[PDB]
Design an enzyme around this catalytic site. Structure first.
Site, mmCIF file in Angstrom:
data_model
loop_
_atom_site.group_PDB
_atom_site.id
_atom_site.type_symbol
_atom_site.label_atom_id
_atom_site.label_comp_id
_atom_site.label_asym_id
_atom_site.label_seq_id
_atom_site.Cartn_x
_atom_site.Cartn_y
_atom_site.Cartn_z
ATOM 1 N N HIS A 18 -13.649 11.023 1.590
ATOM 2 C CA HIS A 18 -12.491 11.729 1.528
ATOM 3 C C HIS A 18 -12.413 12.900 2.643
ATOM 4 O O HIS A 18 -11.305 13.397 3.119
ATOM 5 C CB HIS A 18 -12.427 12.468 0.257
ATOM 6 C CG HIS A 18 -11.927 11.340 -0.815
ATOM 7 N ND1 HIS A 18 -12.143 11.505 -1.978
ATOM 8 C CD2 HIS A 18 -11.390 10.238 -0.800
ATOM 9 C CE1 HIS A 18 -11.842 10.434 -2.765
ATOM 10 N NE2 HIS A 18 -11.158 9.782 -2.000
ATOM 11 N N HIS A 41 -7.793 -1.291 -1.939
ATOM 12 C CA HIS A 41 -8.367 -1.155 -3.248
ATOM 13 C C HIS A 41 -8.095 0.089 -3.811
ATOM 14 O O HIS A 41 -9.252 1.003 -3.775
ATOM 15 C CB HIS A 41 -9.809 -1.643 -3.098
ATOM 16 C CG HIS A 41 -10.205 -3.111 -2.695
ATOM 17 N ND1 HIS A 41 -9.937 -3.432 -1.207
ATOM 18 C CD2 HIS A 41 -10.336 -4.033 -2.972
ATOM 19 C CE1 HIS A 41 -10.165 -4.483 -0.811
ATOM 20 N NE2 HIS A 41 -10.363 -5.148 -2.069
ATOM 21 N N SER A 99 -8.768 8.181 -3.620
ATOM 22 C CA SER A 99 -7.844 8.141 -2.420
ATOM 23 C C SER A 99 -6.613 8.153 -2.322
ATOM 24 O O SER A 99 -5.942 8.886 -1.722
ATOM 25 C CB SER A 99 -8.627 7.020 -1.347
ATOM 26 O OG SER A 99 -9.912 7.143 -1.455
ATOM 27 N N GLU A 117 -4.157 -2.887 -6.511
ATOM 28 C CA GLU A 117 -5.273 -2.979 -7.415
ATOM 29 C C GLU A 117 -5.078 -3.897 -8.291
ATOM 30 O O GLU A 117 -3.807 -3.913 -8.755
ATOM 31 C CB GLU A 117 -5.462 -1.454 -8.044
ATOM 32 C CG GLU A 117 -6.531 -1.402 -9.257
ATOM 33 C CD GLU A 117 -7.712 -1.743 -8.515
ATOM 34 O OE1 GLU A 117 -8.167 -1.371 -7.357
ATOM 35 O OE2 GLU A 117 -8.556 -2.705 -9.237
ATOM 36 N N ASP A 142 -4.085 -8.812 -4.408
ATOM 37 C CA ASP A 142 -5.591 -8.908 -3.815
ATOM 38 C C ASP A 142 -5.251 -8.004 -2.583
ATOM 39 O O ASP A 142 -4.575 -8.141 -1.856
ATOM 40 C CB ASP A 142 -5.533 -10.037 -3.211
ATOM 41 C CG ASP A 142 -6.928 -10.398 -2.290
ATOM 42 O OD1 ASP A 142 -8.010 -10.299 -2.939
ATOM 43 O OD2 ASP A 142 -6.837 -10.103 -1.116
ATOM 44 N N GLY A 143 -6.318 -7.182 -2.265
ATOM 45 C CA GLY A 143 -6.188 -6.009 -1.179
ATOM 46 C C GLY A 143 -6.386 -6.775 0.191
ATOM 47 O O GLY A 143 -5.485 -6.042 0.910
ATOM 48 N N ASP A 163 -11.832 0.357 1.018
ATOM 49 C CA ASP A 163 -13.054 0.863 -0.049
ATOM 50 C C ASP A 163 -13.207 -0.576 -0.798
ATOM 51 O O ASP A 163 -12.842 -0.144 -2.126
ATOM 52 C CB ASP A 163 -12.682 1.881 -0.523
ATOM 53 C CG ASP A 163 -13.579 2.670 -1.444
ATOM 54 O OD1 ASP A 163 -14.766 2.140 -1.324
ATOM 55 O OD2 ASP A 163 -13.252 3.677 -2.254
#
Length: 279
Positions: A18, A41, A99, A117, A142-143, A163
């Site tokens: 972060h 994600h 995030s 997500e 799906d990311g 991430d």
């Protein structure tokens, strides 16, 4: 639904992740033209700290707790810490922002968010965080597939924050392949990848595979709370940044010694900034 609990949220890894995300976002804001924040994600949005039981326990005690109220906080950490304080106005650590909420509070009116997500607890919570924030698009998908579907952004500017899961060998491979696909579509994007150090060899292979893509301008920022081992969990974590903003290297060289001193009072491990691929 009640906010999601997390044992790991706000740990030393999140502090690093972060710190880097906020510095990149502040750099992107130096041009008045819009940009995209794409989070592959995205998780729940925020996390409750301290556990569901009466005792206050969790890794945040060795992470964000050790820096958020320091009187000598480096200027490079102010934007980030002010977001954390916004979610904890009583002055006690109870919530830690994901995030997406760092991005929600730092982005401007003209900027955009694209969040994905899959988890059936986290997704509905994430949707709720962004109700009536029309800048955000929140999808249960799906990311890694978003790096094909959503790039390049119409704004032609952005931070792509990755991430991802690191639970099996294919997880580490999915990361490099996904980045390659995004870069193919949006070569001037800023890509920020978070990684854990549980086994150094997996990270070595991942970085080797990343070099093999031919992608240039790749910076590596790592903070270790302990020396590499075979017989611990996560001893360290890092951020790999493709196309880092002009100031990022300098900013991190400025704050890593302070950060490491606060996060690791015993002085074990290390903190490094270096280039995987120069240029």
């Amino acid at each position: 639904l009640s906010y999601r609990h997390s044992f790991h949220a706000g740990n030393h890894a999140d502090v690093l992740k972060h710190t880097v995300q906020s510095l990149i976002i502040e750099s992107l804001k130096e041009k008045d033209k819009p940009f995209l924040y794409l989070d592959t994600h995205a998780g729940a949005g925020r996390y409750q700290l301290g556990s569901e039981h009466a005792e206050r326990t969790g890794e945040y005690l060795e992470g964000i707790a050790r820096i958020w109220q320091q009187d000598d906080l480096p200027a490079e950490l102010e934007a980030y810490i002010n977001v954390v304080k916004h979610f904890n106005r009583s002055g006690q650590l109870r919530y830690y922002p994901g995030s997406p909420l760092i991005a929600r509070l730092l982005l401007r009116e003209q900027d955009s968010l694209q969040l994905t997500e899959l988890h059936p607890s986290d997704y509905p919570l994430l949707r709720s965080e962004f109700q009536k924030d029309s800048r955000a698009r929140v999808e249960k998908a799906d990311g890694f597939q978003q790096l094909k579907a959503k790039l390049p952004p119409v704004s032609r500017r952005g931070l792509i924050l990755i991430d991802p899961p690191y639970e099996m060998k294919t997880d580490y491979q999915a990361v490099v392949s996904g980045i390659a696909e995004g870069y193919k579509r949006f070569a001037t994007g800023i890509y920020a990848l978070w990684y854990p150090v549980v086994l150094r060899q997996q990270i070595k292979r991942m970085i080797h595979d990343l070099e093999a893509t031919g992608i240039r301008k790749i910076l590596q920022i790592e903070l270790a709370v302990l020396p590499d081992s075979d017989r611990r969990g996560m001893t360290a974590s890092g951020m790999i940044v493709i196309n880092p903003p002009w100031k990022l290297e300098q900013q991190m060289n400025n704050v890593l010694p302070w950060l490491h001193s606060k996060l690791v009072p015993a002085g074990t491990g290390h903190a490094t900034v270096s280039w995987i691929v120069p240029e």
